């Protein structure tokens, strides 16, 4: 029954927290070349000096959806949130368009956003590793 997103801060850190960009030479350390972030961005700098509204904006829709699911569980039972989550998982799982970033029509229908526009829709948005094969590897988990 949350309105503003909560529990947004990270509780533990490690040098191998980002599993997708781990170095092959030293698996305990990240691969800075394939990160393509400019080469001078330690993870610790991401723990301080953040805009206070960024976490609220990034997790707003998920928080509203979780509150809706909790209300369904309280009023309708377990089956209703179970079915909503199952439908959303099925739709999101079988969509794989490496050349596009726009969401599916069916996802918008499920989210009741058929005729709704937010700034995420208006503003939806290298040398190394920005190709189809990286997306294939991330999708398949290989």
């Amino acid at each position: 029954m949350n309105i503003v997103p909560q529990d947004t801060f990270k509780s533990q850190v490690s040098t191998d927290q980002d599993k997708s960009v781990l170095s092959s030479a030293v698996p305990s350390l990240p691969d800075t070349l394939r990160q393509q972030e400019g080469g001078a961005v330690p993870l610790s700098t991401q723990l301080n000096d953040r805009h206070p509204l960024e976490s609220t904006l990034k997790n707003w829709e998920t928080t509203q959806r979780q509150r809706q699911m909790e209300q369904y569980r309280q009023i309708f039972g377990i089956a209703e949130p179970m079915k909503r989550t199952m439908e959303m998982e099925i739709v999101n799982r079988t969509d794989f368009n490496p050349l596009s970033t726009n969401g599916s029509i069916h996802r918008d229908i499920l989210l009741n956003k058929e005729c709704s526009i937010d700034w995420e829709d208006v503003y939806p948005g290298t040398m190394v590793g920005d190709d189809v094969h990286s997306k294939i590897e991330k999708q398949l988990g290989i």
Partner: protein, 248 residues
């Protein structure tokens, strides 16, 4: 981890054809006829409102306004068309209106719809859409335009065309009845004549749906005071107007 992927629902046949696209085209060919005619000062889009006798015809409309200057019609499966129309209306704002402050030209919106339809063939989760669309519009730098979009996502511009069950005969009639000096009223009359040969039952204003892209309509703007605010160019003819044109 066999649930992290789904194999493609659309694949090539040994002859080199995508079967699902061909079957969607077959489903399009089994639908009600819809036609479009491009004139010098407007475009006409027409369809037959085939239906139960107890169903209210005005509740369901096969002609939809996409932008104040762009409308569309379809042949095939209605729900797919409804979903695509909602998406096209949203995309006209997300990609163009909120960026340039203007509505998109006809060709770019047609391209967006075509891309959405194409993405349904490179999928392991959905089958391709089973509709063919006729999109008519007007824009400042390109004038009047008429396009046809197929289930594969291919689109082409036409001077006049027809899709659906009676597409071949309607195309023959339009080929024999089209010239580059045609006017909007002449196009409306030709569209009525072409639809006359296709409708089997009652042929009146309650079984025909007509829309035009012509001059601006200040009376449909809803407000007055700004001279540079152009009125909508899309206009759907009423049943009374269709009856009056048929009687004459």
């Amino acid at each position: 981890m066999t649930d992290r992927y789904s194999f493609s629902l659309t694949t090539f046949s040994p002859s080199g054809k995508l079967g699902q696209i061909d079957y969607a085209l077959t489903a399009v060919k089994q639908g009600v006829t819809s036609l479009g005619i491009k004139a010098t000062n407007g475009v006409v889009i027409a369809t037959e409102k085939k239906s139960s006798p107890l169903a209210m015809s005005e509740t369901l409309s096969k002609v939809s306004l996409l932008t104040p200057d762009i409308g569309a019609v379809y042949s095939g499966m209605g729900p797919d068309y409804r979903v695509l129309v909602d998406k096209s209306r949203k995309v006209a704002h997300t990609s163009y209106k909120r960026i340039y402050g203007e509505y998109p030209p006809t060709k770019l919106l047609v391209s967006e719809v075509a891309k959405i339809m194409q993405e349904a063939t490179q999928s392991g989760g959905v089958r391709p859409f089973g509709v063919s669309l006729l999109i008519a519009g007007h824009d400042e730098f390109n004038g009047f335009s008429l396009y046809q979009v197929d289930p594969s996502g291919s689109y082409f511009p036409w001077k006049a065309t027809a899709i659906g069950k009676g597409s071949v005969a309607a195309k023959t009639f339009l080929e024999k009845r089209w010239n580059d000096e045609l006017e909007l009223e002449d196009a409306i009359h030709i569209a009525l004549l072409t639809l006359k040969e296709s409708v089997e039952g009652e042929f009146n204003g309650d079984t025909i749906e007509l829309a035009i892209i012509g001059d601006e309509n200040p009376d449909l703007l809803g407000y007055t005071g700004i001279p540079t605010d152009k009125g909508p160019r899309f206009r759907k003819l009423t049943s009374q107007e269709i009856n009056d044109r048929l009687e004459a």
